[PDB]
Amino acid sequence: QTHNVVHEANGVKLRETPKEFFERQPNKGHIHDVNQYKQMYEQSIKDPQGFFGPLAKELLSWDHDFHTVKSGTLKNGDAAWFLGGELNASYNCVDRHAFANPDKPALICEADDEKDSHILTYGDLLREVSKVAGVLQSWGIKKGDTVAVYLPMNAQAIIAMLAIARLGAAHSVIFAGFSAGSIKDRVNDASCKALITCDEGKRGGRTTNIKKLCDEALVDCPTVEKVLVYKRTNNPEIHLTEGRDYYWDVETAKFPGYLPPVSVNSEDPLFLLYTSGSTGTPKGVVHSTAGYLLGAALSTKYIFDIHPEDILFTAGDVGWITGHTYALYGPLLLGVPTIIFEGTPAYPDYGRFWQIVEKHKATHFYVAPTALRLLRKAGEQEIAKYDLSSLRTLGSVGEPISPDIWEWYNEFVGKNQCHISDTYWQTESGSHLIAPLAGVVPNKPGSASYPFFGIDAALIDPVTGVEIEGNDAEGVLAIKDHWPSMARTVYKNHTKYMDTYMNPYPGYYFTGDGAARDHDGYYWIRGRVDDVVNVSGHRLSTAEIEAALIEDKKVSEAAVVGIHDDITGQAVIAYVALLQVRKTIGPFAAPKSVIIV
Amino acid sequence: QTHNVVHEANGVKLRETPKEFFERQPNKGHIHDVNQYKQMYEQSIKDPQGFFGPLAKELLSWDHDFHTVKSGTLKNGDAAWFLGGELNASYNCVDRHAFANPDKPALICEADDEKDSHILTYGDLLREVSKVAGVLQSWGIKKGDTVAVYLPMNAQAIIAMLAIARLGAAHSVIFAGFSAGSIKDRVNDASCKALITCDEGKRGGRTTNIKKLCDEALVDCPTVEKVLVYKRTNNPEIHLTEGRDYYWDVETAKFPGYLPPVSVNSEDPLFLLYTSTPKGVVHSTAGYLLGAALSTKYIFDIHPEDILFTAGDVGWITGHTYALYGPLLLGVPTIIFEGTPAYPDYGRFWQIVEKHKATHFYVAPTALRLLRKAGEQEIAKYDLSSLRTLGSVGEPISPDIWEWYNEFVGKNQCHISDTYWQTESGSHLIAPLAGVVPNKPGSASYPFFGIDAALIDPVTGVEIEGNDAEGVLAIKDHWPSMARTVYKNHTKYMDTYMNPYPGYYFTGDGAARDHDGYYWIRGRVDDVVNVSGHRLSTAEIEAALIEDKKVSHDDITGQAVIAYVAKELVLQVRKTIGPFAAPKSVIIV
Amino acid sequence: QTHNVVHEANGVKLRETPKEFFERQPNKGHIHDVNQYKQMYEQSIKDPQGFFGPLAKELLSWDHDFHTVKSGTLKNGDAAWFLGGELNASYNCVDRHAFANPDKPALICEADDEKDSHILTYGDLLREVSKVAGVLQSWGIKKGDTVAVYLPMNAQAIIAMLAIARLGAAHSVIFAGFSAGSIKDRVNDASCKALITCDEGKRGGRTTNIKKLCDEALVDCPTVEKVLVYKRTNNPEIHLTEGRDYYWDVETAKFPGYLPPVSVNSEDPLFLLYTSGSTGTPKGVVHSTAGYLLGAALSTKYIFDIHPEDILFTAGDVGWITGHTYALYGPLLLGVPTIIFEGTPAYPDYGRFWQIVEKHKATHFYVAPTALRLLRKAGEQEIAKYDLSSLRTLGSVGEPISPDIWEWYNEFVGKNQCHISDTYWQTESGSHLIAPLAGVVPNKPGSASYPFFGIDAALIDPVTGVEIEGNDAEGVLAIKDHWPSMARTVYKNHTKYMDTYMNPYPGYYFTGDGAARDHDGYYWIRGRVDDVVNVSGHRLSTAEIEAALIEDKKVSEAAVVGIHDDITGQAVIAYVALKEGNSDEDSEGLRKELVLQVRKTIGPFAAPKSVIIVQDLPKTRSGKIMRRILRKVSSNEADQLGDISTLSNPQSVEGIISAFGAQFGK
Ligand SMILES: Nc1ncnc2c1ncn2[C@@H]1O[C@H](COP(=O)(O)O)[C@@H](O)[C@H]1O
Ligand SMILES: Nc1ncnc2c1ncn2[C@@H]1O[C@H](COP(=O)(O)O)[C@@H](O)[C@H]1O
Numbered sequence A: 001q002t003h004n005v006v007h008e009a010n011g012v013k014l015r016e017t018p019k020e021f022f023e024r025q026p027n028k029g030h031i032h033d034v035n036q037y038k039q040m041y042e043q044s045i046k047d048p049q050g051f052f053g054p055l056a057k058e059l060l061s062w063d064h065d066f067h068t069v070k071s072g073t074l075k076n077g078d079a080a081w082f083l084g085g086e087l088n089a090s091y092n093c094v095d096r097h098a099f100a101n102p103d104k105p106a107l108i109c110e111a112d113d114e115k116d117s118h119i120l121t122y123g124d125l126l127r128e129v130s131k132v133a134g135v136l137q138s139w140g141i142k143k144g145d146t147v148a149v150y151l152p153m154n155a156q157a158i159i160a161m162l163a164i165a166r167l168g169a170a171h172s173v174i175f176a177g178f179s180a181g182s183i184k185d186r187v188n189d190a191s192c193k194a195l196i197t198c199d200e201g202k203r204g205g206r207t208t209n210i211k212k213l214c215d216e217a218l219v220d221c222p223t224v225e226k227v228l229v230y231k232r233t234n235n236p237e238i239h240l241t242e243g244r245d246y247y248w249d250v251e252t253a254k255f256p257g258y259l260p261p262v263s264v265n266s267e268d269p270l271f272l273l274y275t276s277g278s279t280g281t282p283k284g285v286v287h288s289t290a291g292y293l294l295g296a297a298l299s300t301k302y303i304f305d306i307h308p309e310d311i312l313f314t315a316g317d318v319g320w321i322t323g324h325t326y327a328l329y330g331p332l333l334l335g336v337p338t339i340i341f342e343g344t345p346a347y348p349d350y351g352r353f354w355q356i357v358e359k360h361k362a363t364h365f366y367v368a369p370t371a372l373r374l375l376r377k378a379g380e381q382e383i384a385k386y387d388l389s390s391l392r393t394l395g396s397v398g399e400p401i402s403p404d405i406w407e408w409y410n411e412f413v414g415k416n417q418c419h420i421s422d423t424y425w426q427t428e429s430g431s432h433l434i435a436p437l438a439g440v441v442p443n444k445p446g447s448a449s450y451p452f453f454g455i456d457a458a459l460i461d462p463v464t465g466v467e468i469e470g471n472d473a474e475g476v477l478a479i480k481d482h483w484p485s486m487a488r489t490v491y492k493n494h495t496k497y498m499d500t501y502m503n504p505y506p507g508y509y510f511t512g513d514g515a516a517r518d519h520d521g522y523y524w525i526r527g528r529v530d531d532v533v534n535v536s537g538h539r540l541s542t543a544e545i546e547a548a549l550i551e552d553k554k555v556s557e558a559a560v561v562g563i564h565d566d567i568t569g570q571a572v573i574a575y576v577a578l579l580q581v582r583k584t585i586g587p588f589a590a591p592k593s594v595i596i597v
Numbered sequence B: 001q002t003h004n005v006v007h008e009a010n011g012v013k014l015r016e017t018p019k020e021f022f023e024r025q026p027n028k029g030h031i032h033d034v035n036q037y038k039q040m041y042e043q044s045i046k047d048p049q050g051f052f053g054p055l056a057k058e059l060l061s062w063d064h065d066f067h068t069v070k071s072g073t074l075k076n077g078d079a080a081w082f083l084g085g086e087l088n089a090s091y092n093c094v095d096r097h098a099f100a101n102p103d104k105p106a107l108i109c110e111a112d113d114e115k116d117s118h119i120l121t122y123g124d125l126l127r128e129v130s131k132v133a134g135v136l137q138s139w140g141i142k143k144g145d146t147v148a149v150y151l152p153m154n155a156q157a158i159i160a161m162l163a164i165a166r167l168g169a170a171h172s173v174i175f176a177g178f179s180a181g182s183i184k185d186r187v188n189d190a191s192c193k194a195l196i197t198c199d200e201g202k203r204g205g206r207t208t209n210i211k212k213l214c215d216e217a218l219v220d221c222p223t224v225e226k227v228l229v230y231k232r233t234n235n236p237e238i239h240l241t242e243g244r245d246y247y248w249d250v251e252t253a254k255f256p257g258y259l260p261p262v263s264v265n266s267e268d269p270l271f272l273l274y275t276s277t278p279k280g281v282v283h284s285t286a287g288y289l290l291g292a293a294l295s296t297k298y299i300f301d302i303h304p305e306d307i308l309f310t311a312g313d314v315g316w317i318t319g320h321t322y323a324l325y326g327p328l329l330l331g332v333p334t335i336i337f338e339g340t341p342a343y344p345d346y347g348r349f350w351q352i353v354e355k356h357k358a359t360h361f362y363v364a365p366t367a368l369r370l371l372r373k374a375g376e377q378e379i380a381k382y383d384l385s386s387l388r389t390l391g392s393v394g395e396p397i398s399p400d401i402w403e404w405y406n407e408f409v410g411k412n413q414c415h416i417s418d419t420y421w422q423t424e425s426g427s428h429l430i431a432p433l434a435g436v437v438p439n440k441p442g443s444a445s446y447p448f449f450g451i452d453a454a455l456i457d458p459v460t461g462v463e464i465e466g467n468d469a470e471g472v473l474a475i476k477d478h479w480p481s482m483a484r485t486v487y488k489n490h491t492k493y494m495d496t497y498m499n500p501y502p503g504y505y506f507t508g509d510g511a512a513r514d515h516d517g518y519y520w521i522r523g524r525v526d527d528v529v530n531v532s533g534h535r536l537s538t539a540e541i542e543a544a545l546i547e548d549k550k551v552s553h554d555d556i557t558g559q560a561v562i563a564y565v566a567k568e569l570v571l572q573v574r575k576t577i578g579p580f581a582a583p584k585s586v587i588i589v
Numbered sequence C: 001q002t003h004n005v006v007h008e009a010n011g012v013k014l015r016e017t018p019k020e021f022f023e024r025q026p027n028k029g030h031i032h033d034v035n036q037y038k039q040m041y042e043q044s045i046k047d048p049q050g051f052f053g054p055l056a057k058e059l060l061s062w063d064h065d066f067h068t069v070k071s072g073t074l075k076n077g078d079a080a081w082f083l084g085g086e087l088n089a090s091y092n093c094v095d096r097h098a099f100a101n102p103d104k105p106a107l108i109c110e111a112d113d114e115k116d117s118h119i120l121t122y123g124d125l126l127r128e129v130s131k132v133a134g135v136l137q138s139w140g141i142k143k144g145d146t147v148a149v150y151l152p153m154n155a156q157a158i159i160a161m162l163a164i165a166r167l168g169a170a171h172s173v174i175f176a177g178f179s180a181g182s183i184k185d186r187v188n189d190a191s192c193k194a195l196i197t198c199d200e201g202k203r204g205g206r207t208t209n210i211k212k213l214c215d216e217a218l219v220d221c222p223t224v225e226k227v228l229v230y231k232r233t234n235n236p237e238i239h240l241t242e243g244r245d246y247y248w249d250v251e252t253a254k255f256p257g258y259l260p261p262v263s264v265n266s267e268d269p270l271f272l273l274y275t276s277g278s279t280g281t282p283k284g285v286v287h288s289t290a291g292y293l294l295g296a297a298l299s300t301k302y303i304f305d306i307h308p309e310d311i312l313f314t315a316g317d318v319g320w321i322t323g324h325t326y327a328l329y330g331p332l333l334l335g336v337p338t339i340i341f342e343g344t345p346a347y348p349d350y351g352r353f354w355q356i357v358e359k360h361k362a363t364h365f366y367v368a369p370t371a372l373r374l375l376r377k378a379g380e381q382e383i384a385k386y387d388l389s390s391l392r393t394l395g396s397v398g399e400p401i402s403p404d405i406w407e408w409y410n411e412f413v414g415k416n417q418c419h420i421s422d423t424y425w426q427t428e429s430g431s432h433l434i435a436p437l438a439g440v441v442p443n444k445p446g447s448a449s450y451p452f453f454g455i456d457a458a459l460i461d462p463v464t465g466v467e468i469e470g471n472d473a474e475g476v477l478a479i480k481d482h483w484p485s486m487a488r489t490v491y492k493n494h495t496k497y498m499d500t501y502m503n504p505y506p507g508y509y510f511t512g513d514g515a516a517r518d519h520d521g522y523y524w525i526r527g528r529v530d531d532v533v534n535v536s537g538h539r540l541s542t543a544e545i546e547a548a549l550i551e552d553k554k555v556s557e558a559a560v561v562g563i564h565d566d567i568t569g570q571a572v573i574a575y576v577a578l579k580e581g582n583s584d585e586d587s588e589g590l591r592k593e594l595v596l597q598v599r600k601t602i603g604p605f606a607a608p609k610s611v612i613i614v615q616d617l618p619k620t621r622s623g624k625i626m627r628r629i630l631r632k633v634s635s636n637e638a639d640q641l642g643d644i645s646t647l648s649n650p651q652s653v654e655g656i657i658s659a660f661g662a663q664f665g666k
């Protein structure tokens, strides 16, 4: 009953989900209790064909039926799901709901300034996606191409991603906070034929130089033939290059409000998302179509307990995987409205998150602990001004959540009446790996709890590389078989993919994280074992910051470490031996302080 | 019984279809009587899914089943039909009939000079289409591309169109009477990658300079990579540009008589058709084909044993729908006439009908007016007793011409179908169903399946309830064969059809509805002139006149155009718009 | 009982299949008896829709069902099968077997040197095919493109072909023994965007200069954008051209072990295979996808009696149609292992074939008579060293098999316990046309026996062009309706296709062969009726050889004919006339040079057996060479030339007879 290895586990009472959760639940839950969960879970590991087969047919609409549920192994890096099947990501996210209820809200868009907020119905989204898709089709964008997206977190970003997917092309979303150099690297690696952006961005009332950074990068991007520019501010001083740049509003007006979607194979790439690794240059993580969409829909439904009547607010950016899966693909596949927030939790005041939740009666809130830490510092008193009683599920993502923040999250936001789901996962998993199912799995503050369907989690002895049997254990977190939404390769560098995930511990997938398993099977994430730092939820590479410092002619040696920060979670401190990081990686990746030694 | 608004209807006796019509009918009619028609019609308006769904499966062959019959609205300009479905236009017009009866006639080709006439079976047609499609495929023509066609009304025009559609590309047929400037505009707007044409054309004994005008236009058409040239006259003095121009016979000889068709979506473009700067009217694939087959079957009463003669040019929608797609979809032979009604003599139309025992005749009133003036005596020299349906298209038909049409051509034994429609509707909108709807001479009668016709008060934009009324003709919901956009200019599409009267489709025509529900077309309300059935833009004629450095009613053509400018000036309009659009007389003021 | 025309059939006892054949048979045979065969055959001719429709659904995996089994006619050259259907060749040959049993052997690869041999499972093959397909896809190779393959008979050649087919492209395999000139012709006719080859080849212990000949050809192949090079020897002195050439291992490492296959139409081109005609320029024979695959699976299954437990050894090269159909597509469609042999039957010794069969317990052996004649001459003593008791079906292909060799094959290889399948067919037929079904059709040594499913064979009177009714007859061999695996065209030259196969005898397919039909319906192939030579079972173009000799500026006239060879069946004899030659001793030095010029233009395998130097060739009034005279002189029938006063230079004949006599041996 006492853990000698998992010291976080001693004396931690299980936290049942509050009674108000089930009062607010609009229908009978998708899973009765944890005992039904383990039965379903045991099938997803022992019999994936019988478990995922029906779920894929239930949750997805297919243009061609699949003949094989599961293929490949980790050691060979040839995983595949629903082979032979065809579908379209934008049909499952838009069309099928537009035909059913075209007036149902799809994108609840809360702008940086609330005056600019708006709502797109599923019918509205279909027309806007069709029109943008029509623009790209006339430009020659076809299945197999990649299209870059450099946009803030607003309606246009979602429309761009779905419009690209509508044609069978693969979108590559570049976070709007990246510098011009980072844009150059990602666009060139994928050899994108087109780019979608805007003139300027609004964030916290400040104006972002979006189109300006694109131009600086595009001088070294010979593959980019055309650029679509949305007039977000309509600043007339923004230069467009004749013959290359065209306005979003001008071109979409030329095309009809419906365009047929293009069928793609289950294993055709849906998108590339570039992530910073422990060594070298950022790598383009590739996700399939069917496996990723099933992972997105399945986790959104069961881990958050989403029903058609619900409304999800994921306070994350599509520049990162959190926005891809749980701001766009997850909720739209299920046909529920999703709240797309362009601004910050502090503008105009630290009650923005809560005013939004109250305004739209959101039932699910998904946020990073970094924001929780900041709101506890500057805006705790603002919570009580707003209703917030429509919520029943509160999500945590991107970084470990201390038991302290978990309790504050539960009490001040949840009124001690909501379920909290600390979801562990990463860009390469596509969707959740370990997380407490809402209304099913009791919580231990600071623990991700049980592995999700299809995730056979394990602990490996780092010194011997041998899997650790039994509980009260610690080691590197690894998965024993692949899962539908697992990333399939690194763009045109499958060797880097293998050396990173499949080769370090043959037969397993290597998460790069350490974890612990207590007497009850609950998993406690202990953080990265490589040289990767998660600052404010953003995965950074200490090697990538060191490389930026060395680019300066003054610097000869540079080493980046990590410290504990009560607001940024993890801070990075640079040691240099004889603004550069803000122009190489981006303002968000800047060192906290540079120490000259 | 008394009309105070629709004065055309007063004292107009209903004209039942003659008994000889049903004697000549080869099978029991497709609709028993007007009472079954109204039932079928009322379902097509109240329950389109249950009506068109089954008909789409009956009349068309699908590569992928559709999951939604109908989507979109006019107010949003996002109409779509049979979503998720896949098919191929050339498979439904050729392959499926060639496999069933390869020796059945498909294209009955009557050349300008009868010595050059010939007949292609469905098996022959499949091979010629496959061969041309193979040439284009080897040139890189792929689904999504556009291919221009500048050919007379002969087998090559039909084969080219079906070959382009076989690859999933969209053909853009340019009337062979257009000038080099008009060719340049259409090719560049569509950005065609290839062009199919011939060296010269023969029409009425005259030689037309087809390839010569193409070369003149192609100096300003950078998108055209290759040109396929058919030796219509084999005149050896016609130059081919090395590396761009290739001979039809030489290239088709390199490829096999079967090429797999390419599946396209129900809503993928089938073709562009430019109508008067000119605009490319775009038609979908599945909806357009269903409209063509549905109207051809029920309005004309077409059975497999029948033979259709549409005296129209593929340069216009009439040739697209009722000379090619309509008849071929149903698997019947279609007569493709390259010449004029007067060459070699004014009995040509009737000699053709006799020669091939045609059962259906479809012509424009302008041709009837000409034959009535110059060739009435020739009609009685030919049999013509195989006919039972006589169609009129393109312009209103006077009660006089209706009676002359009925008496001298029909011998008072045929059903007459005055069909109202336009390029953007794809197929018939208002027409008397053969053997079902009694006629009122000069009236198109009842709206067709899926057409919910209405009259709108132009001043208030409010729909007019009740009969004995007049107003702007508008339709209250979209239909399968309705055009979907204007190529790369959807904004003009909306401003022309959907925005003038939101929620309705604006035909640009005024009409009247009498106490029996019959519609009387009263003509255009905008500034478009229909000369001999050709929709012209008076703005386009004025614009051509000003380009010149110097410049700063008809009883046969229906409408003539007179220019007021302040021998050469007529030729200037012939070089900008085309000889067919030339002013009758230019008055210099 | 006595044949007055088919003299090969007189006094020939039927040879029933030995009882040991059925003991070794692993399951119930696919055909009950000869009567069930005749019933199935009669349906395949009278009711093709009802016969091939069901078989097509049984043996092939479809991505889209077909709506029409059969379309078109021969006279119109628009044959088509399974219209509307979609499938992929690499899915039916790899994926569906890998998913079922990924560990089952697929390619049993026996290298030129046995130390380098290896085995790929269907799981391995799926990964290697997926990776190469990924490279080609990233290079822009898409459905409709052609990709050349210039590789030896090993694992990479099979992987290359299947990877190309996986993307919907059409592969054009170029035999590894061709010179740079033959490569240039084939690559340019097809306008290939990419080429897959290796640095060097090993065959019989000898090193072949593959990439070197490849580079030499590519200087005149502007269509080739990129080249994939496999390190067969890893010889570091082999230059790769920057920007065009890339290493197989380097590029394949960048892509994952699964790639979705691309659905193609039943009638989309699967491959081009260039064949020599009486034309001088090679012809790209085009094969469909669905029809060709069904023919391969159907014939492999029923003619050879292949079961999942079996192991097939087709001793043929993918450079020729026999490797395409019966080393690759046939066995892999059925999911059985296939033995891919890179070397020769003589290296390291003349028991190699038998060492391979014994090593892997092969159940089926498929070889050309030329090899049997060589082994009978040089390697009969090697047979007694090996087991060979796992075989039950012995096939012969490519050329006529004499009754003597039939018996030698039967006794020394089959130990008088195997069924022998003399299979008649050709590059353009895709699969077997006339052959004795294993365990079903009794044999007549030297006869192909009965026509196979869907082949309505006929004999046409050469004088009247009228089909011959009744048996004990001889004439032109023709087929009365098209069949699934029939070639569909000649690449971008359908007119040559029609003029060659469909127009000579309207309503029929013209095989180019003469045959005879005896009183039992058995067909006896009598050889080509056009002037085409089969050297070692392979079609050569004497016109193409003449052109190579003339390229040498020493030569002014050249005429090449075929004659009898006791090992290769037919050899080619060149008659050359030089401009100001003379020197009746320097001749030997000139003859040697002329040979080497053909070896560097077409290839060593197509080099003439002997070059005869003459003063002029027999020419007609119009000035055309009378090759019939050269044929008859070269076979010692200088009597039986007839009246030659039709020649413009009859006095030349005497010199032809003396030259051949004096120079043939030397
Ligand atoms: N619930 C969690 N607990 C601990 N760490 C987390 C959690 N969620 C995400 N992470 C970290 O975030 C990384 C993934 O970040 P990213 O690749 O940016 O999505 C993981 O590898 C973890 O280190
Ligand atoms: N039966 C008819 N009666 C009157 N006008 C007609 C009739 N049929 C067609 N039209 C005219 O033809 C025009 C279409 O021309 P086009 O676009 O060239 O086919 C319509 O707008 C009508 O003015």
Ligand SMILES: Nc1ncnc2c1ncn2[C@@H]1O[C@H](COP(=O)(O)O)[C@@H](O)[C@H]1O
Residues within 6 Å of the ligand: C275, C321, C396, C397, C398, C399, C400, C401, C422, C423, C424, C425, C426, C427, C428, C448, C511, C512, C513, C525, C527, C528, C534, C537, C538, C539
């Ligand atoms: N079993 C056989 N008997 C006799 N000749 C054959 C046989 N198989 C193939 N051939 C010959 O090989 C030719 C085909 O050449 P190729 O396709 O190049 O191998 C045929 O036309 C025949 O002349």
